[PDB]
Nucleic acid binder design. Structure first.
Lengths: 63, 135, 143, 127, 206, 63, 67
RNA sequence: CGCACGCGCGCUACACUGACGGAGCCAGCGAGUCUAACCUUGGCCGAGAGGUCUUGGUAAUCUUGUGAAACUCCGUCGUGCUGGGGAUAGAGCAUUGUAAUUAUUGCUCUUCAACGAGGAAUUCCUAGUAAGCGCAAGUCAUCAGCUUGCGUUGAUUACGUCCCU
């Protein structure tokens, strides 16, 4: 799979049961035309780097 | 160290002093594999023979032991340790028994044969410890 | 340079001078520091059993060139070891003093260390001038 | 600029004073020679400013090391402080200051284990 | 190195670690290089230090602990079990007493095979424990990329101390193998055996 | 069987990648206390380079 | 021969502490230098030597009878 | 304080960062006889223990620089219910207590046990907190294991809310 790097320029906080899950808005890292909302569990912030697997999966539920 | 091998000489298990004083443990702790001999008996031999604990030990010669037979064979003149042994200057006999596998347990339990035939503690209840705790 | 006695390491002074005492043969072999162990914090007596005593009786060649005490009940405090008491942690060690009549009364045999009156042992010019011959059989062979 | 100062650092309750004056260039750190320093690996636990500012600036100092306390990780991690405290015997009274800007840029946030009191405080267990 | 001649004895090797820059007795840090996308940034040797134990208030803010030092995050591959940390202070010795063997196998400085080795275990996918209501299934989701990292680094924390705890050979010298071919999936080892199982466990029932 | 180790070291130190006591275990002869004895006389041959010394941890390096 | 104070109690020091430095002049028996003791919990323990007649330090003592 | 069972407490051992023969020899919350038997600093008595044949002390001095411990370096052993453990117990030694019995712990040396980080559940955790390691004390006539401290050296992981409660 392509290592679809998602720059984490904005972030929606820290929620969940234990306080770990996170909603994450991403404008893309390599090009700057993908606009993908995702969910990532764990410590992330504004202006960081993450990975997403598939091509252009704008999936909004990943807990 | 020395890159030299030999022709069938070294074993791995011996049969020494009527039991298994082995050819992978030394004088010292294969006389602990058989019950009755501790460390500093053959480690005071180190100041006279320089044989300590650092080897795989199918190497012993039966003529170095003959200057240790100068330390062993008569238990009345030959440097028997006197703050060391299993049972030693006993109530049983009175001599410092640094004995062997066939001669520790026969020289161990004359304190347990005694006291409550004598009505106190160890002459029925240790026989009860042989009529019950032995079967 | 100003090569001197304090500017050498821990046992490149004691056990490096013991490379020449084996060609002389000088000190005292005790009888029963041997069957007993040397302390309470011990498991096994020393290996070499010929050097074995040179490594112990010349440990005062630089330790008391510098300072002024090795005692008998006094070396308890300096020599606390690892006393696994089973239920308790490691603790403090009380040491041996009988045939230091042949061990710590073998320290004055070389003439390096004599016995101090504060408590312990002290050094003289006999242990600072002759060490410029005998410890400078190491110090003037490290130069 | 030569301090005649016991620059003082407490080792968490103790007297870690470094006797400071001018010198010749003769490193004496705890008796044993630099040829035969007893840790061969933690030998390099003595030299931070002698890989940063150089052996050219401060070769005119007489290092003394006398502290009370220590073990594995403070005896031969923090006699390293001595060549940031007895190498810099160059900043009060006698011999010219001029080298001052580069000891207030590379010694400002470098390692607070040496240049200020190391903040590994004592241990109250949170009552 | 333009020597200043001393009456105080110093050998040839002591002053070598300054202009001939090798921040061990015989080992460098000169080539920090990275292939994949996971582990670039935190080789934090920029202050001229031999050991660089920077332990201050790098735990209070929410961003600054990512920038925590390499000895204070990444060279924690040595302390994990606690009978050797519980008689603690014997634990400074592993990497420098071991790594000259790894400095033989195609390594001039020992980071050169390790250019393409640490990073290339880049984590892309891991499940969450689904609630499920009964059936504890697994979902095709993504954690942050610190698992196949810790399948290769936290399994070197155990893999140096706690997988060498009670080992046939010693503690620090079973590390004659731990960073030779750790680049990509071999699957025949103590830590690489569950490397495919981040891209298939979240793929099998997804 | 007298000096087969003498020829299969001087022709096999540039065949074995390392020099240790585990080389000898491939023939399944000895595992035991003749090993920490043999670290101070082995390298009088002169093909593999020693590096470091410590009395509790006597470690050298393959070449 | 010595004097040893006994001290179990930080707020009522400056009545005799100034009688040691700012008003010990009024009988011309000078003092030797006081070492600043490490004050363990408080013990302010002074020490004065007596080479003097029966009056003056016992004048500081026997007028100080308010038990 | 004797033991068919069961629990918890801490301390260990199940190993080669292990401890051992000796050199490298640091702290403090420090505590020590009045109308006396305390802290202890001289060699040795002693296999060992200290008596304090002596001495120093109304005290950061004399112990004391509590020359503390885990400890760092020349030599010891490459996995063998093992040079791991002293588990249980014996024989050769005390400081005492008017006598060591159900031995009260200080003292030389052998007996070397279960147990291959161990099924369920979890104990505390953020700039000084895990983590060891000491010191001396009510325990002391026999020490601290509980304890209150101080001192020595001081790791993975982090600002979050109810999923447990």
């Amino acid at each position: 799979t392509p290592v679809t790097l998602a720059k984490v320029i904005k972030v929606l906080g820290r929620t969940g049961s234990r306080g770990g899950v996170t909603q994450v808005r991403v404008e893309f890292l390599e090009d700057t035309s993908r606009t993908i909302v995702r969910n990532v569990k764990g410590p992330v912030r504004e202006n960081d780097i993450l990975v997403l697997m598939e091509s252009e999966r704008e999936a909004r539920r990943l807990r | 160290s020395l890159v030299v091998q030999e022709q069938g000489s070294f074993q791995h298990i011996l049969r020494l002093l009527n039991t298994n004083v082995d050819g992978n443990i030394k004088i010292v702790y294969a006389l602990t594999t058989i019950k009755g001999v501790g460390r500093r008996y053959s480690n005071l031999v180190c100041k006279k023979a320089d044989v300590d604990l650092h080897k795989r030990a199918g190497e012993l010669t039966q003529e170095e032991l003959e200057r240790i037979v100068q330390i062993m064979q008569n238990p009345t003149h030959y440097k028997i340790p006197a703050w060391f042994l299993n049972r030693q200057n006993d109530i049983t006999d009175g001599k410092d028994y640094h004995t062997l596998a066939n001669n520790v347990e026969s020289k161990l339990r004359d304190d347990l044969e005694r006291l409550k035939k004598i009505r106190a503690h160890r002459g029925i209840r240790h026989f009860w410890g042989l009529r019950v705790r032995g079967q | 340079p100003g090569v001197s006695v304090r500017d050498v390491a821990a046992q490149d002074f004691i056990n490096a001078y013991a490379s020449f005492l084996q060609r002389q043969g000088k000190l005292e072999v005790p009888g029963y520091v041997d069957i007993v162990k040397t302390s309470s914090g011990n498991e096994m007596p020393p290996q070499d059993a010929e050097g074995w005593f040179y490594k112990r009786a010349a440990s005062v060649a630089r330790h008391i060139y510098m300072r002024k005490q090795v005692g008998v009940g006094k070396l308890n405090k300096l020599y606390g070891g690892a006393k696994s008491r089973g239920v308790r942690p490691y603790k403090h060690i009380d040491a041996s003093g009988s045939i230091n009549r042949k061990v710590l009364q073998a320290l004055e045999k070389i003439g390096i260390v004599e016995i101090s009156p504060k408590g312990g042992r002290r050094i003289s010019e006999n242990g600072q001038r002759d060490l410029d011959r005998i410890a400078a059989q190491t110090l003037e062979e490290d130069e | 600029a030569v301090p005649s100062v016991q620059t003082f650092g407490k080792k968490k309750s103790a007297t870690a004073v470094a006797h400071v004056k001018a010198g010749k260039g003769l490193i004496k750190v705890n008796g044993s020679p630099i040829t035969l320093v007893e840790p061969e690996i933690l030998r390099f636990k003595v030299y931070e400013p002698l890989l940063l500012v150089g052996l050219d600036k401060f070769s005119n100092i007489d290092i003394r090391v006398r502290v009370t306390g220590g073990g594995h990780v403070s005896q031969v991690y923090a006699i390293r402080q001595a060549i940031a405290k007895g190498l810099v015997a160059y900043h009060q009274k006698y011999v010219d200051e001029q080298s001052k800007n580069e000891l207030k840029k590379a010694f400002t946030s470098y390692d607070r284990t040496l240049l200020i009191a190391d903040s590994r405080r004592p241990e109250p267990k949170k009552f | 190195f333009t020597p200043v001649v001393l009456a105080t004895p110093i050998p040839e090797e002591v002053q070598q670690a300054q202009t001939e820059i090798k921040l061990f007795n015989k080992w460098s840090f000169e080539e920090v290089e990275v292939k994949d996308a996971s582990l670039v940034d935190y080789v934090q040797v920029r202050q001229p230090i031999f050991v660089a134990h920077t332990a201050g208030r790098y735990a209070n803010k929410r961003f600054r602990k990512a920038q925590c030092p390499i000895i204070e995050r990444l060279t924690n591959s040595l302390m994990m079990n606690g009978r050797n940390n519980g008689k603690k202070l014997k634990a400074v010795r592993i990497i420098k007493h071991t790594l000259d063997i790894i400095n033989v196998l195609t390594d001039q400085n020992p980071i050169q095979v390790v250019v393409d080795a640490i990073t290339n275990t880049g984590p892309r996918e891991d499940t969450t424990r689904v609630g499920g209501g009964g059936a504890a299934r697994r979902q095709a989701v993504d954690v942050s990329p610190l698992r196949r990292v810790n399948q290769a680094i936290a399994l070197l924390t155990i893999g140096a101390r706690e997988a060498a705890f009670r080992n046939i050979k010693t503690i620090a010298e079973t590390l004659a193998e731990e960073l030779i071919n750790a680049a990509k999936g071999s699957s025949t080892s103590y830590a690489i055996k569950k490397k495919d199982e981040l891209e298939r466990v979240a793929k099998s029932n997804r | 069987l007298d000096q087969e180790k003498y020829d299969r070291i001087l022709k096999e130190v540039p065949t074995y990648r390392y020099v240790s006591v585990s080389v000898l275990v491939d023939r399944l002869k000895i595992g035991g206390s003749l090993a920490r004895i043999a670290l101070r006389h082995l390298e009088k041959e002169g093909i593999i380079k020693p590096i470091s010394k410590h009395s509790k941890q006597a470690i050298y390096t393959r070449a | 021969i010595r004097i040893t104070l006994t001290s179990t109690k930080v707020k009522q020091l400056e009545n005799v502490s100034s009688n040691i430095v700012k008003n010990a002049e009024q009988h011309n028996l000078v003092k030797k230098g006081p070492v600043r003791l490490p004050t363990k919990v408080r013990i302010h323990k002074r020490y004065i030597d007596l080479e003097a007649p029966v009056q003056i330090v016992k004048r500081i003592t026997q007028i100080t009878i308010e038990p």
